[PDB]
Design a protein around this ligand. Structure first.
Ligand SMILES: NC(=O)C1=CN([C@@H]2O[C@H](COP(=O)(O)OP(=O)(O)OC[C@H]3O[C@@H](n4cnc5c(N)ncnc54)[C@H](OP(=O)(O)O)[C@@H]3O)[C@@H](O)[C@H]2O)C=CC1
Ligand SMILES: NC(=O)C1=CN([C@@H]2O[C@H](COP(=O)(O)OP(=O)(O)OC[C@H]3O[C@@H](n4cnc5c(N)ncnc54)[C@H](OP(=O)(O)O)[C@@H]3O)[C@@H](O)[C@H]2O)C=CC1
Lengths: 414, 396
């Protein structure tokens, strides 16, 4: 009934709104983030439409002392981290210090990738496991023992992917298969903002997607490849044929560990050709580069010229479809299942005033938070969603805005 | 034997390089431009490989007295203008004042196209002639009588196009035809404002004593370029159409086409989409932020030439004269782009021919008015060998 939410961007705004819709679970919330004015505007926008009591504060979640002081002052039962993944460990340390629960949506990656202690563990991992993405669960899983000892719950990656995709996996394994062997996670965004080119997020993340090496997991080994070197096509329910490429994703790591006997796990994402050409163009004229220069570094000078940051929410027309195709065995017989959710952009902006990218992450975040606090998912330790009972989550998904679909004998990627 | 060179960008870098390779004609040269640092780096980079004595200076060729004081001080026999077209009139004035010769590569375009008295001249022209390009020869042709009286030579547009494309025309008229009727000029392949107006300015050509202006890039064609292949072409307006229509007797139609790769046309369309070509911290204009951004990675070839259709001994005849230059043999020789190379060499030849006596004629001239022969032998000699095709393939 008393919750502290850290961060106040797109995801947070959806998660906070859905939270105020279930005011009987959440009687009081505190919205703290780097720029307090964002917290205040959201409070303004929400106050009067909910019975939930909303307080706000400025907070630099990169400083644990500042985070601890806050928990100490507001006294919450849990902390929902909807800030950046850079703050994961700091917020987790404070939760342990003050004995409150932790929920987030993205795993940890250092903000400064030149930090000596971070490189040493990172480089060692690049040599041992085989994949070189800057983020992974190693740092957060390491809290397993201290959290279990403090009787604290740490629910990790509770958005859509990661998050729901793991809930889909657990659900599939509990009701449809005896053993899952192949998991292909397909993320499709078929929305049209109306502009020739525009970015939904921090424009440097877009650069990370198309340029970072892509990787997957196959029979106990990570497999890394040249960025965007694996292409495919799929006819997405309610959207259509879309070109999709294999990228690396957080959940592949937890899934490979938690789904017994699993043989291969891949994650693909859609990329329209105009978008792809628009961005090898921008990176060719070096407009995405970070090399500071004078006299302003460019990538964010571009951020200035591009369309309003978040004012694509009212403009965007289209749909997203994120799901998973499972191949496994039930009663000694091969079986394929596809579970997905189709989210419509304009329904998202009409309801909470955001795009579907924020919506599909925000809603699962609140549900993950609800189940932890209401007791359903309160277990000491650090957890990824596939390790918990999927049932109450799948119900909350139907109840709170993200109904799902299950298809037996679907169309395969290959 | 003594020359003042104004400007020190790409073209100038090539030109001076070529100039120093012929030190028996050019004993000492002076390299002066806005930023003296480049003049010095170029000077260090060359001297020791040449016996030509090299001096350098800072000069804002926009102020006429500063130019005159430099000419009076350095006492050169001629001035090669390889700065921007904005400095043409300023430099020609100094040349006339001090009695020295003049050579440039592009004709005049005012730097501030909003300046009142310029526009009055400009618009009057737009109404009479029919073409609206900001640049034209009228300004410089006006100097004809004064230069002739001072016994001075002003050679206009001595690059590839204009320039060599005009030498090709004079050559074709002298050796291959009795009369040229159709001239089609074909140019095949770091300033986005030049590229931007290149793809957006109205296109125009000349036909039967009249100019015809059309929608920008509304006219497309394709041609299989010798040594390069099939490429896409669009009709653009170009300087030499004006001089040729005046100087090629009986010519009936003159057109200019330029190639535009699909890869380039989209890059251009992408940049215009994210608003990087716009013109408007809250004190910046986009297109100039873009210039701040940008040798061996570049691979390819250029092919610039002209297709003439005419009459010789009462029979229609077609001729194709062109030059093929490859980017790296020129970057391996003088360290530059093929665009600067194909303009740099013509810039020197005209200068050499003007002051060694070959082309010294009092007055203002475009290249088609002079004997093309010494210029082409020179083109073969200094790096830009040409080709002649009888019965080549047409356009249309
Ligand atoms: N499938 C999934 O599950 C996905 C999950 N996500 C996750 O959700 C988060 C995205 O939120 P997103 O909508 O892009 O959020 P935004 O980038 O708009 O989030 C902005 C909020 O983070 C706050 N913040 C950042 N740094 C700090 C700090 N040091 N201290 C306190 N607050 C801070 C910001 O402060 P300020 O307002 O001043 O900038 C801001 O309010 C991501 O970290 C990402 O990992 C994203 C995509 C997919
Ligand atoms: N085929 C052809 O016939 C072609 C012709 N051209 C011609 O070549 C010239 C192009 O030179 P380009 O290679 O593009 O040159 P650049 O754009 O690199 O020329 C730069 C030089 O111009 C000098 N400059 C500019 N303004 C002044 C001034 N007011 N006073 C003194 N110096 C000045 C610059 O000084 P600084 O470096 O300090 O700015 C610099 O050295 C043009 O005039 C154009 O007409 C262009 C393309 C091909």
């Amino acid at each position: 009934s008393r919750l502290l939410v850290i961060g106040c961007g797109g995801v947070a705004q959806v998660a906070i709104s859905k939270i105020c819709q279930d005011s009987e679970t959440f009687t009081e919330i505190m919205i703290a983030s780097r720029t307090k004015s964002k917290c205040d505007d959201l409070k303004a926008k929400l106050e009067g439409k909910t019975s939930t009591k909303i307080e706000t504060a400025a907070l630099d979640a990169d400083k644990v002392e500042e985070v601890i002081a806050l928990i100490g002052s507001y006294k919450p039962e849990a902390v929902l981290n909807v800030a950046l993944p850079y703050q994961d460990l700091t917020i987790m340390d404070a939760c342990l210090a003050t004995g409150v629960h932790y929920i987030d949506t993205a795993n940890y990656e250092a903000e400064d990738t030149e930090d000596p202690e971070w490189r040493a563990i990172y480089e060692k991992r690049c040599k041992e496991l085989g994949f070189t993405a800057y983020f992974d669960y190693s740092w957060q899983w390491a809290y397993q023992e201290k959290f279990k000892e403090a009787g604290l719950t740490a629910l990790l990656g509770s958005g859509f992917d990661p998050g729901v995709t793991s809930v889909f996996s657990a659900y599939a394994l509990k009701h449809y298969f005896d053993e899952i062997h192949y998991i292909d996670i397909l993320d499709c965004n078929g929305g049209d903002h109306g502009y020739p080119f525009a970015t939904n997020f921090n424009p440097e993340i877009n650069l990370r997607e198309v340029s970072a090496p892509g990787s997957y997991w196959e029979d106990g080994k990570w497999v890394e490849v040249e960025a965007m070197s694996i292409k495919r096509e799929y006819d997405f329910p309610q959207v259509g044929q879309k070109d999709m490429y294999l990228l690396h994703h957080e959940e592949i790591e937890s899934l490979a560990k938690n789904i017994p006997g699993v043989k291969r796990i891949r994650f693909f994402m859609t990329f329209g050709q105009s978008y792809l050409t628009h961005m090898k163009c921008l990176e060719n004229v070096g407009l995405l580069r970070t090399d500071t220069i004078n006299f302003i570094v460019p990538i964010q000078f571009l951020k200035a010229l591009l369309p309003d940051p978040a004012s694509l929410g009212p403009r965007t027309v289209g749909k997203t479809n994120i799901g998973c195709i499972f191949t496994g065995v039930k009663d000694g017989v091969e079986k394929t299942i596809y579970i997905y959710n189709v989210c419509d952009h304009q329904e998202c902006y009409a309801e909470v005033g955001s795009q579907a990218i924020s919506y599909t992450t925000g809603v699962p975040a609140m549900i993950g938070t609800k189940l932890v606090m209401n007791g359903t998912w309160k277990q000491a330790g650090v957890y990824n969603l596939e390790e918990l009972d999927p049932d109450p989550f799948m119900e909350a998904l139907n109840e709170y805005g993200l109904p799902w679909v299950v298809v037996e004998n679907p169309q395969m990627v290959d």
